[PDB]
Design an enzyme around this catalytic site. Structure first.
Site, mmCIF file in Angstrom:
data_model
loop_
_atom_site.group_PDB
_atom_site.id
_atom_site.type_symbol
_atom_site.label_atom_id
_atom_site.label_comp_id
_atom_site.label_asym_id
_atom_site.label_seq_id
_atom_site.Cartn_x
_atom_site.Cartn_y
_atom_site.Cartn_z
ATOM 1 N N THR A 62 21.654 50.291 41.833
ATOM 2 C CA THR A 62 21.780 50.613 43.242
ATOM 3 C C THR A 62 23.117 51.270 43.490
ATOM 4 O O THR A 62 24.130 50.586 43.566
ATOM 5 C CB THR A 62 21.679 49.372 44.111
ATOM 6 N N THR A 63 23.141 52.597 43.579
ATOM 7 C CA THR A 63 24.372 53.315 43.883
ATOM 8 C C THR A 63 24.024 54.535 44.707
ATOM 9 O O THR A 63 23.368 55.451 44.212
ATOM 10 C CB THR A 63 25.119 53.743 42.623
ATOM 11 N N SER A 96 22.025 49.841 37.878
ATOM 12 C CA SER A 96 21.870 51.218 38.309
ATOM 13 C C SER A 96 21.502 52.076 37.111
ATOM 14 O O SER A 96 21.874 51.769 35.976
ATOM 15 C CB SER A 96 23.148 51.742 38.946
#
Lengths: 204, 220, 230, 248, 239, 241, 202, 195, 233
Positions: free
Chosen positions: G1-2, G170
């Site tokens: 998650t980025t 990520s």
């Protein structure tokens, strides 16, 4: 467990042109037996019974609300209920208390009033319908009952041998359960008659 | 619980097992996990069986409203919106994680709906306890724009691997084929597991079980 | 706010005079005829269609409720679409509760109650629609007729709308119980031909049937197939 | 608004409620419907209004409504008001059978529905229901009973009475011929069609003719049965035979 | 009759309670407003019925947002209620959407609130007409007018009240599109002292406010010396 | 009968002794009280044209409009009382944006006009409010091409060509004669036929500031409101014929 | 998650990874994390997977109906305030830090960080997600005032590739989007097209 | 903890109850009446969590009287026991009534009726029943000696053996015991059995 | 005839007859007069007996320390409005810890009385008020039925009040510089213009309210009215 506070164990099994349904008779509080003639199988029609195991107060609560709805149904419509419709009604009634659930897992065994096809089914405690073609069991000794009925069931039996296998399944299953037993009633549902029997069982 | 889906050239192929367990005991042997929702939309339900049962009754009912109201066949995204709004409104307390697959006027679609209301659009999905074993077969063997039979063998092989390598699944493979020009609900497709033959016979004759009371109730 | 008093009140002869005015609103409507055949039911109705500018595929008078229950009307259109939306809303609540297609008698006994409530509630007028609801269940066909009073009857063949008394005389002349559905459509078109006045086409009638296959409207080419014989 | 309010729930200049009286005037044109209480059962004998050719005969009954396992009822007045009230009757009887696990006594249902009919005559500003209802039913307290209700909310127990068209002339014969405490099912079926041959002056009697149903007790179970077409045609041939033998 | 209720059409298709409220509007005194190059100027003939009244009683210029002003005509008790509706509507728009409400959207919120009473027998239509004016750097200047039927439009110059037509005749003589607002104050004060009926209603006051570039979009009252110079200029032009 | 009346059946929406609703009949006169006329027609590629009255020189003509944008793909022309018109446009905008939110796709045209008609019926049934006395809808349905719908204050509603307002019947008769000449009873010169139809029954031969035209096309499904120079170009292209 | 958005002259550049994990199993490796709230306004979804899709439908509804009524392209600050109200009103039942970016003709390219709380703050660049901690120090050092569009696309791709290298939660492909007056130009960087940084070998 | 016992005979029911009300180490009342008369042919025995008992029993009792006021006749014990069960089950709400009950009644069609009920409102009709921890000590003697055709003096003797077992083995001081018999002639009070 | 039965019916002249009839309820009641200086505000009112030993219904209510009102008309409507103003000043004290300004409070009353003048089934309030108060802006005299309200230098409402308005129009030039003793005497003569010629101002039937900068509001009744009654004429 909350299901095992009263004990209890009901099964159904399909035969050729007949179904058999049997329930235990012990009404229990975890260790103390209170009475030995507790009625769990109720008539919902001429050739259609419903069996409810589990918490014995929820058996009577669900069965009184079920009879309240079913009498309104059969007075408003002018016919007897087909068993699949009764399965959907009981699943609806249990699912209305989804997050407040009744502690009963009903089983339904009966005959279609027009076609006279055998029908059996069971439910979970929150309303998943499970239509099977061999047998359905419900209660605190479920492993014993699947163990007996997986080996004793054979398809296309006459009512005599269906009585014999469901009686041997019940009597051999409940004698390995502490909190169930104490007598058993057996209902044979045929096209032309209902046979109501009680068995010799261990009373310990 | 092992269900799967692929997006192939003409539509969606869905698959399932049939074993439904309660506790750690097999409860049902031939449970149908591919729900009817629309004539084109089918919804595989994993997780809590009663919650996904009443959910794929209710959304099926609302689509039976809507297809009659507009007079057209419903879209996938309509059932997607209804599912994600209800499952977000109950905050995931409905324990149903769904695969909503269908074919509408914009071609096939495959959505995976997590119980809290998060949706993903995917070319292939796996859910349930044996999701990882079938996901292995999909990562190994999936290609875009596959034919019908290659997609059917791929989903059946993935459901087979999820059957053999998990305790939580087994005993049948159901399929479903959805396209623009056809609907093929193949139940069952392959039966990899078979009951053994019982070597002894235990048929109790009349009089084997003792009887205490008997009542004959005659009917018409 | 909404009024709370009823507008349908008893006349000194005991007649709910708003209902007996709404039945005259029915009698001025477009004529509709339904016949119960032996193997099914036929519904057919006149489309009150002047003005070639109308696109006939935009409105339907024969509108289905379930896979084997449909209905037709005579009277005011915008009340009929209210009854269709409500009847669908009742039949799908039945399908949620019992997981069964609703019995036709069990949809009529609810739609008739919904029509009854507006002859007694506060500040509403009764509906101006008389319905014909048909159904095939228990391998037996049904034909029902609901009125703005909320009463319902079971018919074998009936007619409503303009000149319905002569429609009922033509049906009692032409009805027999052994009628096949393909002849049942033919007798219904001969009944609607009595007061059509103006060269019937595939675009100015609407015929629906229900049988073992289900309920469906007939496509205008299939309408022209029968109307070529008429 | 106040220009349009018809004030259905106010008094007359004489202490009358005009809508409640006009409801009874609507009842006076309804179908002739009588019921006779006997020793071993109760009947109901009514005129059917569904008398056109093209009707379907779908239900087992037209105006007879089973309310629970132990009771039945007839209606006369508006058909739709009757449908609404008998749906309420079924809800009351099943709320009682829910709450006490025994079937309801026959008078509690009638006073409950007369409570509902009385409430709409006083407040709310609606129109009142314009229906009479005849009430038969068995219970273990008083056995076979009969009641009659009106739109005002009154009720009484009767052994024979008649509502609808030609009410007073039928009850005048019923005063004459009722054998108090000696009537069977068969003699009551004779007497009811004896009176119904005297009140059905439109289309002198032909075969489909009536709805007539009896309430009896068999083997500890209450049965409510509508007589078949064959049974009623044989009974009316028996009545016309009795009319033939009446002179000599 | 057909005129006792706002929920009844006449046989000719007129709703008489609204068209009777439009007679109630043109009972009241004159208020005019002129949109110009860089802002909006309002002018109201403010009667003072008796010399016991303080200055500032019965204001007919309201602020409904910090960049929007309002001029009213008709029954003033209704107009204060519509001022509070417009104040709540502009407050809710600033709270939700984070910026000052466009006058087009504000007039079409308040016009729907006014229209909502011309449908029901349970209420009566508002007895007042009103104008809304504003200015911002992004939007220019805008002047919208609402009558009791609920219908709103955008205007270059408007007059409402009992002297409507003569005031619109005199406004139309003016080249309002190219003038500075300091000129527009004198031109408005001209028309107000022109239309005044000095024989019928006696004691009155001039009330003026502008919103525009020269106050940076803030709706303010005209300062005292400029009002008195406009009064002097217009009373000498009355001659 | 023949104009009989019983009590308050000329004051509220209750039935006459014949079965007519008088207030719903009287609501059609309020469309004629507006004093305007609009014409709508569709071809294989739909167009609405209405008049624009500027009686007062003080009006900002950018804000006088009877062509409204319902959503990005569906446009609309109203006729009748003006405040009711903007009300029912606000209600159509709310139902069209509510359909998209509930159902995930842009609303059909017939499922917008059926919804507006089911709203407008409630005022013809409940006694405490009056019916809105004032709508023609256009948009590209993907399968049927252009659509033209007309809902009215009684709640009815599907057209190939239509008119609204004062000159409804005569422009209807003009379009009814013109469809018989056209092949497959369908139009070809969409932008031009509306201008001829509007100029014929009114006999004004309009200025480009007098009419406003909106088009929805299969090439551009967005509802598009034309500029003044384009309507002037169509008026002069019709002028040289 | 980025997720990452970078303001430049004339528009904004967005970036996001494509890995959605449940526990430590990758549930979806081609997740699209840029949601169009309007034509030229994108919101980015980090945190709870349900809430950032559930609020965004309500904001898309309100902003579309608002844009129809006001007859204008809607502002980016309006789209940020509709999140700042709603994510504050339900803040104890949402776990949502949104990064709204977009363009409007009135004030240009705009990036609003709405952190978990229902406040609102405009920034020159905004990074979010679980992986942003590993690339704070890169973007504080690399960001120069007024980069071009291509410079910004390389800057967003480098800063995302570093976080995808270091953070285990990520990975996948880099989905970019460049929102400007001319429109939205999306592109996907997969495999060799992702900017590669050699491991610190030996 | 409180003690209840009831014995259902051929045409009678014998019930008994302890006459003690305690508080945490001491008893505050040694003439405590737990027998609440519902009507002429029905008693309701009420033990359990304090507060819920007397409130629940009197709320049932006024409806049992109210049915007689409305109708002019008595509730059957089947109907009154199912009514009590419905009000106790109506549990999954907020309001708990943690009550342990026995209902004894004589019907004028069915004869003597004895109903057992726990705090779950599980209703079980039994030929004999008992509550408390003394039930664990005395139901076994009841299974030892009870026959369906016990005459009433033998039932007093079988009750007295159970009460002497309460005196001999049970650790709570339960010295005095009230007893009533319901018949076709109504309710009959007997002499207190004391130790 | 047909337009006088509802407040929600516009008469075809553009008026509302049920609103104009509500002003008769203020035009019949016992008259009162208000006035102010730059330091004080003074209300003077006729106290109403049904004839006598019923001892003269109050017209001036202690509404706060800093606001008093006068009544003319339906007394229970003014008591409703007194409890309303009590609640508003107490909510302003409870929230902001300063008494509410009088010019905002009278606009709140004008907002409250407006709402029944528009909604069907309701009636306009049949009371007009004179409100005397002191705040940061100094003393105030306000007048409120038709929901309109007025700021006033000195004002006279009630039966035959036009003579008292004439006297106050004559002498309003003096009032800002008169002290507290003279100020009440002017209003006493103003009311005494309206009176029957036989009756004079006594310790019976005349009430006085007074509020100033250093002085909280006091109703002046039977004993306390005696100094201002002395040295009149």
């Amino acid at each position: 467990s909350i299901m095992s506070y009263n004990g209890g164990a009901v099964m159904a099994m399909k035969g050729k042109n007949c179904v058999a349904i049997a329930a235990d008779r012990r009404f229990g509080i975890q260790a103390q037996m209170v009475t030995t003639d507790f009625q769990k199988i109720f008539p919902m029609g001429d050739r259609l019974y419903i069996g409810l195991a589990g918490l014995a107060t929820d058996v009577q609560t669900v069965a009184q609300r079920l009879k309240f709805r079913l009498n309104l149904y059969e007075l408003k419509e002018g016919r007897q209920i087909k068993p699949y419709t009764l399965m959907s009604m009981v699943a609806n009634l249990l699912y209305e208390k989804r997050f407040g659930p009744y502690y009963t897992e009903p089983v339904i065994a009966g005959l279609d009033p027009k076609t006279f096809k055998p029908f059996i089914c069971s439910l979970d405690l929150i309303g998943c319908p499970m239509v099977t073609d061999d047998f359905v069991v419900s209660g605190t000794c479920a492993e014993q009952m699947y163990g007996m009925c997986e080996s004793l069931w054979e398809p296309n039996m006459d009512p005599d041998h269906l009585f014999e296998t469901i009686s041997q399944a019940m009597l051999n299953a409940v004698d390995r359960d502490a909190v169930s037993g104490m007598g058993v009633i057996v209902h044979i549902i045929e096209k032309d008659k209902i046979t109501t029997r009680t068995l010799k069982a261990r009373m310990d | 619980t092992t269900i799967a889906g692929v997006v192939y050239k003409d539509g969606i192929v869905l698959g399932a097992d049939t074993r439904a367990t309660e506790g750690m005991v097999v409860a049902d042997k031939n449970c149908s996990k591919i729900h009817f929702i629309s004539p084109n939309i089918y919804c595989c339900g994993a997780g809590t069986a009663a919650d996904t049962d009443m959910t794929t009754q209710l959304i099926s009912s609302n689509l039976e409203l809507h297809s009659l109201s507009t007079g057209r066949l419903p879209r996938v995204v309509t059932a997607n919106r209804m599912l994600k709004q209800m499952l977000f409104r109950y905050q995931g307390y409905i324990g149903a994680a769904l695969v909503l697959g269908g074919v509408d006027v914009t071609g096939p679609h495959l959505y995976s709906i997590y119980p809290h209301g998060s949706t993903d659009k995917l070319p292939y999905v796996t859910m349930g306890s044996g999701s990882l074993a079938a996901m292995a077969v999909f990562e190994d063997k999936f290609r875009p724009d596959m034919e019908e039979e290659e997609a059917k063998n791929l989903v059946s092989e993935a459901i087979a691997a999820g059957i053999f390598n998990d305790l939580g699944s087994g005993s049948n493979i159901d399929l479903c084929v959805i396209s623009k020009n056809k609907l093929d609900f193949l139940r069952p497709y392959t039966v990899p597991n078979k009951k053994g033959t019982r070597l002894g016979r235990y048929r109790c004759e009349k009089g084997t079980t003792a009887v205490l009371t008997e009542k004959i109730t005659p009917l018409e | 706010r909404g009024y709370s008093f009823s507008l349908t009140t008893f006349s000194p002869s005991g007649k709910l005079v708003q209902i007996e005015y709404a039945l005259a609103a029915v009698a001025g409507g477009a004529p509709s005829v339904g016949i119960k055949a032996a193997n099914g039911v036929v519904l057919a109705t006149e489309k009150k269609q002047k003005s070639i500018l109308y696109d006939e595929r935009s409105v339907h008078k024969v509108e289905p409720i379930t896979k084997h229950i449909g209905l037709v009307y005579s009277g005011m259109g915008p009340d009929y679409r209210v009854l269709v939306h409500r009847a669908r809303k009742l039949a799908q609540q039945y399908y949620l509760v019992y997981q069964e297609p609703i019995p036709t008698a069990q949809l009529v006994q609810r739609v008739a109650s919904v029509m009854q409530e507006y002859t007694q509630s506060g500040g509403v007028r009764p509906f101006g629609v008389s319905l014909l609801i048909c159904g095939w269940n228990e391998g037996r066909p049904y034909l029902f007729q609901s009125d703005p009073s909320g009463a319902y009857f079971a018919w074998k063949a009936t007619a409503m709308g303009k000149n319905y008394v002569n429609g009922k005389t033509f049906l009692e002349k032409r009805y027999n119980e052994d009628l096949e559905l393909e002849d049942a459509i033919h007798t219904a078109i001969l009944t609607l031909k009595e007061s059509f006045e103006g060269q019937m086409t595939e675009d100015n009638i609407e015929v629906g049937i229900c049988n073992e296959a289900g309920f469906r409207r007939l496509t205008p080419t299939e309408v022209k197939d029968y109307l070529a014989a008429i | 608004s106040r220009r349009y309010d018809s004030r259905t729930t106010i008094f007359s200049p004489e202490g009358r409620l005009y809508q409640v009286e006009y409801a009874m005037e609507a009842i006076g044109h309804a179908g002739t419907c009588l019921g006779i209480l006997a020793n071993d059962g109760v009947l109901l004998a009514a005129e059917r209004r569904n008398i056109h050719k093209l009707l379907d005969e779908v239900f087992f009954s037209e105006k007879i409504y089973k309310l629970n396992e132990d009771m039945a009822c007839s209606v006369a007045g508006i058909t739709s008001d009757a449908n609404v009230l008998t749906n309420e009757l079924r809800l009351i009887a099943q709320r009682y059978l829910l709450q006490y696990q025994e079937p309801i006594p026959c008078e509690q249902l009638v006073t409950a529905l007369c409570d509902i009919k009385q409430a709409y005559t006083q407040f709310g500003g609606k129109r009142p229901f314009g229906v009479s209802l005849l009430y038969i039913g068995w219970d273990k307290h008083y056995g076979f009973q009969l009641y009659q209700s009106d739109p005002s909310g009154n009720y009484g127990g009767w052994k024979a009475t008649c509502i609808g068209n030609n009410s007073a002339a039928a009850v005048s014969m019923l005063k004459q011929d009722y054998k108090e405490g000696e009537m069977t099912l068969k003699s009551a079926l004779a007497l009811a069609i004896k009176v119904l041959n005297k009140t059905m002056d439109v289309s002198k009697l032909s075969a489909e003719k009536v709805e007539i149903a009896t309430l009896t007790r068999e083997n500890g179970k209450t049965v409510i049965r509508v007589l078949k077409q064959k049974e009623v045609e044989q009974l009316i041939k028996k009545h016309e035979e009795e009319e033939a033998k009446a002179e000599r | 009759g057909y005129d006792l209720s706002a929920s009844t059409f006449s046989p000719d298709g007129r709703v008489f309670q609204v068209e009777y409220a439009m007679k109630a509007v043109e009972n009241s005194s004159t208020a005019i407003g002129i949109r110009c190059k860089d802002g909006v100027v309002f002018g109201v003939e403010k009667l003072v019925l008796s010399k016991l009244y303080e200055e500032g009683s019965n204001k007919r210029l309201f602020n409904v947002d910090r960049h929007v002003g309002m001029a009213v005509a008709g029954l003033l008790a209704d107009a204060r209620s519509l001022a509070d509706i417009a104040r709540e509507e502009a407050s809710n728009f600033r709270s939700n959407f984070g910026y000052n409400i466009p006058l087009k959207h504000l007039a079409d919120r308040v016009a729907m609130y006014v229209h909502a009473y011309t449908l029901y027998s349970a209420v009566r239509p508002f007895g007042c007409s009103f104008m809304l004016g504003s200015y911002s750097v992004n939007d220019g200047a805008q002047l919208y007018m609402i009558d009791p039927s609920g219908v709103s439009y955008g205007y270059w110059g408007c007059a409402i009240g009992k002297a409507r037509q003569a005031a619109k005749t005199e406004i139309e003589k003016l080249q309002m599109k190219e003038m500075t607002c300091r000129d527009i104050v004198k031109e408005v004060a001209k028309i107000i002292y022109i239309v005044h009926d000095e024989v019928k209603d006696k004691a009155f006051e001039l009330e003026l406010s502008w919103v525009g570039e020269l106050t940076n979009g803030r709706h303010e009252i005209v300062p005292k010396d400029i009002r008195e110079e406009a009064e002097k200029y217009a009373k000498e032009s009355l001659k | 009968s023949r104009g009989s009346s019983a009590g308050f059946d000329r004051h509220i929406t209750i039935f006459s002794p014949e079965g007519r609703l008088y207030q719903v009949e009287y609501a059609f006169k309020a469309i004629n009280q507006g004093g305007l006329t609009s014409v709508a027609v569709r071809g294989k590629d739909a167009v609405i044209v209405t008049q624009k009255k500027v009686p007062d020189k003080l009006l900002d003509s950018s804000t006088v409009t009877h062509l409204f944008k319902i959503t990005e793909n569906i446009g609309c022309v109203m006729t009748g009382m003006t405040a009711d018109s903007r009300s029912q446009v606000q209600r159509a905008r709310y139902e069209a944006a509510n359909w998209k939110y509930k159902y995930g796709y842009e609303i059909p045209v017939d499922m917008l006009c059926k919804r507006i008609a089911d709203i407008s019926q409630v005022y013809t049934q409940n006694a405490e409010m009056r019916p809105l006395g004032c709508m023609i809808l256009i948009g590209i349905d993907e399968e049927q091409g252009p659509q033209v719908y007309k809902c009215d204050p009684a709640g009815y509603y599907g057209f190939k060509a239509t008119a609204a307002g004062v000159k409804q019947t005569e422009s209807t008769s003009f379009l009814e004669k013109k469809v018989k000449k056209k092949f497959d009873w369908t139009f070809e010169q969409t932008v031009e036929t509306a201008i001829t139809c509007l100029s014929t029954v009114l006999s004004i031969d309009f200025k480009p500031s007098e009419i406003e035209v909106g088009v929805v096309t299969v090439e551009n499904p967005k509802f598009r409101i034309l500029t003044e120079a384009e309507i002037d170009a169509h008026l002069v292209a019709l002028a040289e014929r | 998650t980025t997720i990452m958005a970078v303001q430049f002259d004339g528009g904004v550049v967005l970036g996001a990874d494509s890995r959605t994990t449940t526990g430590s199993y990758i549930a979806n490796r081609v997740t699209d994390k840029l949601t169009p709230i309007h034509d030229r306004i994108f919101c980015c979804r980090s945190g709870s997977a349900a809430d950032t899709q559930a609020v965004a439908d309500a904001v898309t509804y309100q902003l579309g109906f608002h844009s129809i009524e006001l007859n204008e392209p809607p502002l980016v600050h309006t789209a940020a305030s509709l999140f700042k109200e709603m994510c504050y009103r339900y803040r104890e039942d949402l776990m949502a830090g949104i990064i709204i970016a977009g363009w409007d003709p009135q004030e240009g390219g705009q990036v609003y960080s709405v952190p978990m709380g229902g406040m609102m703050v405009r920034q020159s660049f905004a990074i979010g997600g679980s992986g942003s901690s590993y690339i704070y120090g890169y973007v504080d050092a690399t960001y120069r005032e007024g980069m071009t569009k291509e410079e910004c696309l390389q800057f967003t791709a480098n800063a995302l590739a570093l976080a995808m290298e270091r953070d285990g939660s990520s990975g996948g492909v880099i989905r970019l989007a460049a929102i400007a007056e001319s429109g939205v130009e999306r592109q996907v960087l997969l495999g060799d097209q992702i900017p590669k940084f050699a491991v610190a070998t030996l | 903890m409180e003690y209840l016992i009831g014995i259902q005979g051929p045409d009678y029911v014998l019930v008994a109850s302890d006459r003690v009300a305690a508080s945490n180490i001491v008893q505050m009342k040694d003439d405590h009446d737990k027998m609440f008369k519902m009507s002429e042919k029905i008693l309701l025995l009420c033990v359990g969590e304090a507060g819920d008992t007397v409130q629940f029993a009197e709320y049932i009792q006024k409806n049992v009287q109210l049915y007689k006021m409305r109708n002019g006749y008595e509730l059957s014990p089947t109907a009154a026991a199912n009514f009590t069960r419905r009000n106790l089950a109506d549990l999954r709400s907020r309001t708990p009534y943690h009550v342990n009950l026995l209902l004894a009644g004589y019907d004028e069609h069915e004869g003597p009726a004895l109903y057992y009920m726990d705090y779950l409102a599980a209703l079980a009709k039994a030929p004999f029943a008992a509550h408390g921890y003394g039930a664990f000590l005395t139901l076994s003697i009841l299974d030892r000696y009870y026959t369906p055709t016990i005459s009433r003096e033998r039932a007093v003797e079988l009750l007295r053996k159970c009460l002497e077992e309460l005196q001999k083995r049970f650790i709570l001081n339960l010295p005095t015991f009230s007893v009533r018999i319901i018949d076709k002639n109504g309710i009959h009070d007997l002499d207190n059995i004391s130790f | 005839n047909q337009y006088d039965n509802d407040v929600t019916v516009w008469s075809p002249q553009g008026r509302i007859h049920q609103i104009e009839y509500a002003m008769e309820a203020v035009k019949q009641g016992s008259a009162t007069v208000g006035l102010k200086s730059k330091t004080h505000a003074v209300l003077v009112a006729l106290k109403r007996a049904q004839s006598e030993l019923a001892a003269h219904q109050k017209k001036i209510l202690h509404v706060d320390n800093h606001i008093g009102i006068s009544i003319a008309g339906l007394t229970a409507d003014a008591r409703l409005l007194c409890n309303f103003m009590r609640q508003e000043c107490l909510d302003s004290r409870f929230v902001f810890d300063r008494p509410l300004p009088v010019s905002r409070l009278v606009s709140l009353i004008g907002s409250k009385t407006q709402i029944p003048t528009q909604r069907y089934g309701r009636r306009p309030y049949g009371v007009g008020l004179l409100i005397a108060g002191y705040d940061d802006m100094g003393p105030h005299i306000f007048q409120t039925p038709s929901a309109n309200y007025f700021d006033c230098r000195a004002m006279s409402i009630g039966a035959r009040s036009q003579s008292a308005r004439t006297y106050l129009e004559r002498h309003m030039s003096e009032f800002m510089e008169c002290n507290l003793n003279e100020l009440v005497k002017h209003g006493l003569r103003a009311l005494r213009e309206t009176l029957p010629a036989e009756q004079d101002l006594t310790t019976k039937n005349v009430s006085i309210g007074i509020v100033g900068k250093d002085l909280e509001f006091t109703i002046y009744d039977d004993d306390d009215v005696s100094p201002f009654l002395e040295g009149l004429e």
